Design an enzyme around this catalytic site. Structure first.
Site, short mmCIF file in Angstrom:
data_model
loop_
_atom_site.label_atom_id
_atom_site.label_comp_id
_atom_site.label_asym_id
_atom_site.label_seq_id
_atom_site.Cartn_x
_atom_site.Cartn_y
_atom_site.Cartn_z
N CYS C 155 0.86 -1.17 0.00
CA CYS C 155 0.00 0.00 0.00
C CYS C 155 0.89 1.22 0.00
O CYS C 155 0.67 2.18 -0.74
CB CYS C 155 -0.91 0.01 1.25
SG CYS C 155 -0.17 -0.59 2.82
N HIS C 182 1.16 5.68 9.61
CA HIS C 182 0.19 4.73 9.07
C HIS C 182 -0.95 4.32 9.97
O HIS C 182 -0.76 4.00 11.15
CB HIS C 182 0.95 3.48 8.63
CG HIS C 182 0.19 2.59 7.70
ND1 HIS C 182 -0.29 3.03 6.48
CD2 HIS C 182 -0.15 1.29 7.79
CE1 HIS C 182 -0.88 2.02 5.86
NE2 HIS C 182 -0.81 0.96 6.64
N1 LIG Z 1 -7.01 -3.07 3.39
C1 LIG Z 1 -5.83 -2.91 3.97
O1 LIG Z 1 -5.70 -2.42 5.09
C2 LIG Z 1 -4.61 -3.37 3.22
C3 LIG Z 1 -3.76 -2.49 2.58
C4 LIG Z 1 -2.97 -2.95 1.56
C5 LIG Z 1 -2.77 -4.30 1.44
N2 LIG Z 1 -3.32 -5.16 2.33
C6 LIG Z 1 -2.80 -6.55 2.44
O2 LIG Z 1 -3.86 -7.45 2.16
C7 LIG Z 1 -3.66 -8.68 2.90
C8 LIG Z 1 -4.97 -9.10 3.51
O3 LIG Z 1 -5.04 -8.67 4.89
P1 LIG Z 1 -6.22 -7.68 5.35
O4 LIG Z 1 -5.64 -6.41 5.87
O5 LIG Z 1 -7.24 -7.59 4.26
O6 LIG Z 1 -6.83 -8.51 6.58
P2 LIG Z 1 -8.14 -9.41 6.78
O7 LIG Z 1 -7.90 -10.35 7.91
O8 LIG Z 1 -9.32 -8.50 6.86
O9 LIG Z 1 -8.19 -10.23 5.41
C9 LIG Z 1 -7.74 -11.61 5.42
C10 LIG Z 1 -8.80 -12.49 4.80
O10 LIG Z 1 -8.18 -13.71 4.33
C11 LIG Z 1 -8.86 -14.83 4.87
N3 LIG Z 1 -7.88 -15.89 5.08
C12 LIG Z 1 -6.86 -15.91 5.99
N4 LIG Z 1 -6.14 -17.00 5.95
C13 LIG Z 1 -6.72 -17.75 4.94
C14 LIG Z 1 -6.41 -19.02 4.41
N5 LIG Z 1 -5.40 -19.77 4.84
N6 LIG Z 1 -7.18 -19.48 3.40
C15 LIG Z 1 -8.20 -18.72 2.97
N7 LIG Z 1 -8.58 -17.52 3.40
C16 LIG Z 1 -7.79 -17.08 4.39
C17 LIG Z 1 -9.51 -14.33 6.15
O11 LIG Z 1 -10.61 -15.15 6.51
C18 LIG Z 1 -9.94 -12.93 5.72
O12 LIG Z 1 -11.18 -12.98 5.03
C19 LIG Z 1 -2.51 -8.41 3.89
O13 LIG Z 1 -1.30 -9.00 3.43
C20 LIG Z 1 -2.39 -6.88 3.87
O14 LIG Z 1 -1.07 -6.43 4.14
C21 LIG Z 1 -4.34 -4.73 3.15
#
Ligand SMILES: NC(=O)c1ccc[n+]([C@@H]2O[C@H](COP(=O)([O-])OP(=O)(O)OC[C@H]3O[C@@H](n4cnc5c(N)ncnc54)[C@H](O)[C@@H]3O)[C@@H](O)[C@H]2O)c1
Ligand SMILES: NC(=O)c1ccc[n+]([C@@H]2O[C@H](COP(=O)([O-])OP(=O)(O)OC[C@H]3O[C@@H](n4cnc5c(N)ncnc54)[C@H](O)[C@@H]3O)[C@@H](O)[C@H]2O)c1
Ligand SMILES: NC(=O)c1ccc[n+]([C@@H]2O[C@H](COP(=O)([O-])OP(=O)(O)OC[C@H]3O[C@@H](n4cnc5c(N)ncnc54)[C@H](O)[C@@H]3O)[C@@H](O)[C@H]2O)c1
Lengths: 339, 337, 339
Positions: C155, C182
């Protein structure tokens, strides 16, 4: 200690199995082969080999899918689609992908999906996702948890890298070209027939055949410092096995003499590369290197520095056996660095 | 006058096309070529041959689906399944089936479906199919036959001079062994195959394989049914092979009498097919030889008056092609519909 | 035109789906989600979001595994092991891996083994095998046949890269440090509890929390020229979304003034980066950047050159929405460059 599968029972794969059999006590344990031909076609060719000669050991056909090398059974299955493979059922820990088809992440990985723990490709990866190792050079760089798909490079690259290192690491390689008079291979036509490379489509047995080769560039993959400095072609000549490389890199260092360049090898040969490099002073010919455990052998009497800066080396390597032997060392590693 | 289609632009496919280009006023006319390979592939290999040597003619890649040979243009298509080939659309009167797969009623037929009229199989026919060996029974042919095989490279050699023997000394029984150059069928390096022999090195061994030419003789010389049979040895040579026949005849005979008979026929009836050669030569000396069989006179020898051995050379590629053309050359003649 | 799957229905994945819905006419077509919670838990959270607010559209639960966004169905499965996924059965063309677990070649590739054609990671790859792209910077570098596993970076990195480029590409970046205040994220503890990083283990909501970040180094992955010149930390502050970067690179060029540095952005903003970069002259605060389609926004009034050579910039980026929007552009690419 560790269960191994061999996907692709041809030359390199069979050369593998053989290499492994007569060994100290490899942690590896071949329990299954995937030769699209059954126990018959897979046995026969393990017992009688035109390039290695009749295999020395009782090889019998048990079951309708289970031959045995001196009592020790080996289950044999067959299917072009790894996904249908019983890797999980059998609990396969390492898979020696020696088909030359599954060489990209998506592909070779199909083995993991089937239930495989780790996959070793007996060739260069087409991806960029996969680590290329070359025992003797950067094998340490491999540690569990770090990618479950690795490539033991090329036969050529695994012959070059080693002594290419000693060159740069103790003389400094500015840059240079290279050629490799190479024994023909399965990918070549027996007689002039259709083939995506109008060179390989020519009678492998009656032509000197020029064909591109990345083996040169890929050296970098293990020796970054050289990235984009080496390069070259390859020449296929009517010789079923055992090849030679002709490296011509004009050095950075002083303007050393011939026989001292050698001494470096000789030094690094009985030292850090004891088992990989070696120097043979006695004037022999290709056929004398059959079944050579060294990943690379330099023809002493052939080395020669020209203008103080330009060094020229010639190395001998059995493309089938040698490589296969490293591939068993690289699979030997995986096991020695396993939880 | 007769539109032709070459399916399977392999060794016999090309050896044929070229064999043709050399003929004068040929009732045949090639118009389309079908091979798994692109226009590039068809051009290159028709021009640069490792056995026949570079082709003397201007061969360029004219078109996206065609190639040019001295101006005469030909289309190059590529469907692994015949039925699709536009044989009907191009009004294909004859198809030279040299792929090695479509050797049966069912297979060769897919050509008929594609709109083709006839299918000449550049190999022995599998099952119930008319087999003809130019010089041994081409008169048996009738425009009625829609699918014919021009037998094997071996049979086409062994037959001609067998006829000569039986038709003169009476073949009682006899075996034969053909020391044969290798072919696309062998594995360049110990690799899987349905014939664990053919599966071997090819260039590093004498590979005993079996041949039909043994019983196939009878196919065209009804009289010898079950009297002949032999094997074959695949030795490290890309072309030209030799047969070692050994028949027992009724009429006691001697060395030179046999050879004589051969010459006689070679000068009269078989002129152009069989031939003798006294000059002590070797394989290579028999490349590009328009004849089907060539007797090595000085080698012919008889035993106990009735056991005759005859050695015979033949260019399994060219000489055969020349026969293939001669057969198709015939279909064009004695063609009504 | 192209079938898409979303593995991981959380923030970024859901932010994805939303981004995609209200769009021109994306070639993409989400047909399946993998939220370990069923249609209920997966629906509710798509409809009611604490940071984006109630989703504007009829979202109903059809079947026991098939909700629908305005009629258009979306099959939903659940299983931690991608291998068991019906990617092949459904014929999934692209997979948006947004879980933060499968970020290495072996892992993310498990999707290919299941039957996936191409895989996009919504985070930095842990391998080296995988290409890191950043729309606006080096998206062209992506072409079919070239790796079937890509990473849309970070991000932060996706906010930096863009304007970092314009800096070096039109002023020459010697080298510099950077910080990023952040908004806290899911990987942080709600209240002081066990966590592999004793910083993230502290109440995400009541602490300024310093935590390493590669986002700095990774800039190189897309902008080689900078390789090993940038770097920095990150500070987590009680703000659920929208963050800011504080870049301090002492330039190579002359010793330009403040407001001209800006003009470069402004220029490259309405030009090559029209949709990625942008400059906001009006003094606002974080909350004013919620749902910002720009991968990066510079606070005009904040920029300031110090000693002629040292330039300092501050950029605004919505970490959830922004990134997700790029992730839909990067998935939009794959499709526009597909056979
Ligand atoms: N929206 C943000 O804040 C943001 C910013 C940029 C990038 N990201 C990246 O996106 C990624 C997702 O994390 P997030 O912040 O969305 O958190 P989150 O916990 O909200 O999303 C994770 C999702 O993946 C699922 N999941 C986890 N382990 C799994 C598995 N083994 N098999 C299948 N599904 C599984 C969970 O149930 C959940 O729905 C991270 O690496 C994060 O760094 C998020
Ligand atoms: N021994 C050598 O000459 C040598 C040297 C170094 C490396 N290699 C590399 O090893 C690889 C293997 O080729 P080779 O030279 O051993 O030829 P080969 O044809 O003898 O070996 C290929 C084997 O893989 C099997 N195979 C092919 N496609 C398959 C599929 N889809 N599923 C399952 N099995 C399949 C074949 O049946 C055969 O047993 C090549 O990439 C080659 O470059 C070979
Ligand atoms: N060369 C000889 O000694 C000789 C002479 C007599 C008989 N034959 C027999 O004739 C047959 C023809 O083989 P060849 O000698 O021409 O060598 P070959 O194997 O090179 O010819 C086969 C060619 O047909 C092509 N082909 C295969 N399937 C095809 C399809 N479905 N559609 C289009 N093209 C297809 C292949 O790509 C290849 O180029 C073989 O079975 C051979 O045994 C050979």
């Amino acid at each position: 200690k560790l269960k191994v599968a061999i996907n692709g029972f041809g030359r390199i794969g069979r050369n593998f199995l053989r290499c492994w059999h007569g060994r100290k006590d490899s942690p590896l344990d071949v329990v299954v082969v995937n030769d699209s031909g059954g126990v018959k076609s897979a046995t026969h060719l393990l017992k009688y080999d035109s390039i290695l000669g009749t295999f020395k050991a009782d090889v019998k056909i048990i079951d309708n899918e289970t031959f045995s090398i001196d009592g020790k059974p080996i289950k044999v299955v067959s299917n072009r689609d790894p996904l249908k493979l019983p890797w999980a059922e059998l609990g396969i820990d390492i898979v020696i992908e020696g088909t030359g088809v599954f060489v990209d992440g998506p592909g070779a990985g199909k083995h993991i999906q089937a239930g495989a723990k780790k996959v070793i490709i007996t060739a260069p990866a087409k991806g960029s996702d996969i680590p290329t190792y070359v025992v003797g050079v950067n094998e340490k760089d491999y540690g569990h948890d770090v990618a479950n798909i690795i490539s033991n490079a090329s036969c050529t690259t695994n012959c070059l890298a080693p002594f290419v290192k000693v060159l740069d690491e103790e003389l400094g390689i500015v840059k240079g070209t290279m050629t490799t008079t190479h024994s023909y291979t399965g990918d070549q036509r027996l007689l002039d027939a259709s083939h995506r490379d109008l060179r390989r489509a020519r009678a492998a047995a009656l032509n000197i055949v020029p064909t591109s080769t990345g083996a040169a560039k890929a050296v970098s993959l293990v020796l970054p410092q050289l990235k984009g400095k080496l390069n070259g072609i390859a020449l296929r000549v009517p010789t079923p096995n055992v090849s030679v490389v002709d490296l011509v890199v004009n050095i950075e260092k002083v303007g050393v003499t011939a026989e001292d360049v050698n001494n470096a090898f000789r030094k690094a040969a009985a030292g850090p590369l004891k088992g990989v490099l070696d120097v043979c002073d006695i004037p022999l010919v290709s056929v004398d290197f059959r079944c050579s455990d060294f990943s690379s052998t330099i023809d002493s009497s052939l080395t020669m520095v020209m203008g103080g800066d330009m060094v020229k080396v010639v190395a001998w390597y059995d493309n089938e056996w040698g490589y296969s032997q490293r591939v068993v060392d690289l699979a030997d590693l995986v096991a020695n660095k396993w939880p | 006058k007769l539109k032709v289609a070459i399916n399977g632009f392999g060794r016999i496919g090309r050896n044929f096309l070229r064999c043709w280009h050399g003929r004068k006023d040929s009732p045949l006319d090639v118009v389309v070529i079908n091979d798994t390979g692109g226009v590039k592939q068809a051009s290159h290999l028709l021009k640069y041959d490792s056995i026949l040597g570079t082709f003397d003619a201007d061969v360029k890649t004219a078109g996206d689906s065609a190639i040019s040979v001295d101006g005469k243009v030909i289309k190059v298509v590529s469907d692994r399944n015949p039925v699709n080939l536009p044989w009907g659309d191009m009004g294909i009167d004859l198809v030279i089936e040299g792929t090695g797969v479509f050797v049966d009623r069912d297979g060769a037929g897919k050509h008929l479906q594609a709109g083709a009229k006839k299918v000449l199989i550049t190999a022995p026919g599998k099952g119930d199919i008319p087999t003809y060996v130019v010089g041994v029974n081409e008169e048996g042919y009738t425009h009625a036959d829609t699918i014919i095989s021009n037998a094997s490279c071996t049979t086409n050699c062994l037959a001609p001079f067998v006829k000569v023997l039986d038709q003169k000394f009476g073949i009682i029984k006899g075996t034969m062994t053909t020391t044969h150059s290798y072919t696309g069928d062998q594995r360049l390096l110990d690799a899987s195959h349905r014939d664990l022999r053919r599966a071997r090195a090819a260039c590093l061994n004498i590979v005993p394989t079996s041949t039909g030419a043994a019983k196939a003789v009878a196919l065209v010389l009804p009289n010898l049914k079950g009297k002949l049979n032999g094997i074959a040895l695949r030795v490290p040579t890309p072309n030209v092979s030799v047969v070692d026949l050994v028949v027992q005849v009724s009429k006691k005979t001697f060395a030179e009498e046999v050879n004589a008979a051969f010459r006689e026929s070679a000068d009269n009836e078989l002129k152009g097919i069989l031939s003798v050669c006294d000059e002590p030569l070797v394989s290579i000396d028999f490349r590009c030889t328009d004849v089907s069989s060539t007797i090595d006179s000085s080698l012919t020898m008889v035993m106990g008056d009735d056991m005759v051995k005859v050695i015979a050379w033949y260019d399994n590629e060219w000489g055969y092609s020349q026969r293939v053309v001669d057969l198709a050359d015939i279909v064009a003649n004695k063609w009504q519909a």
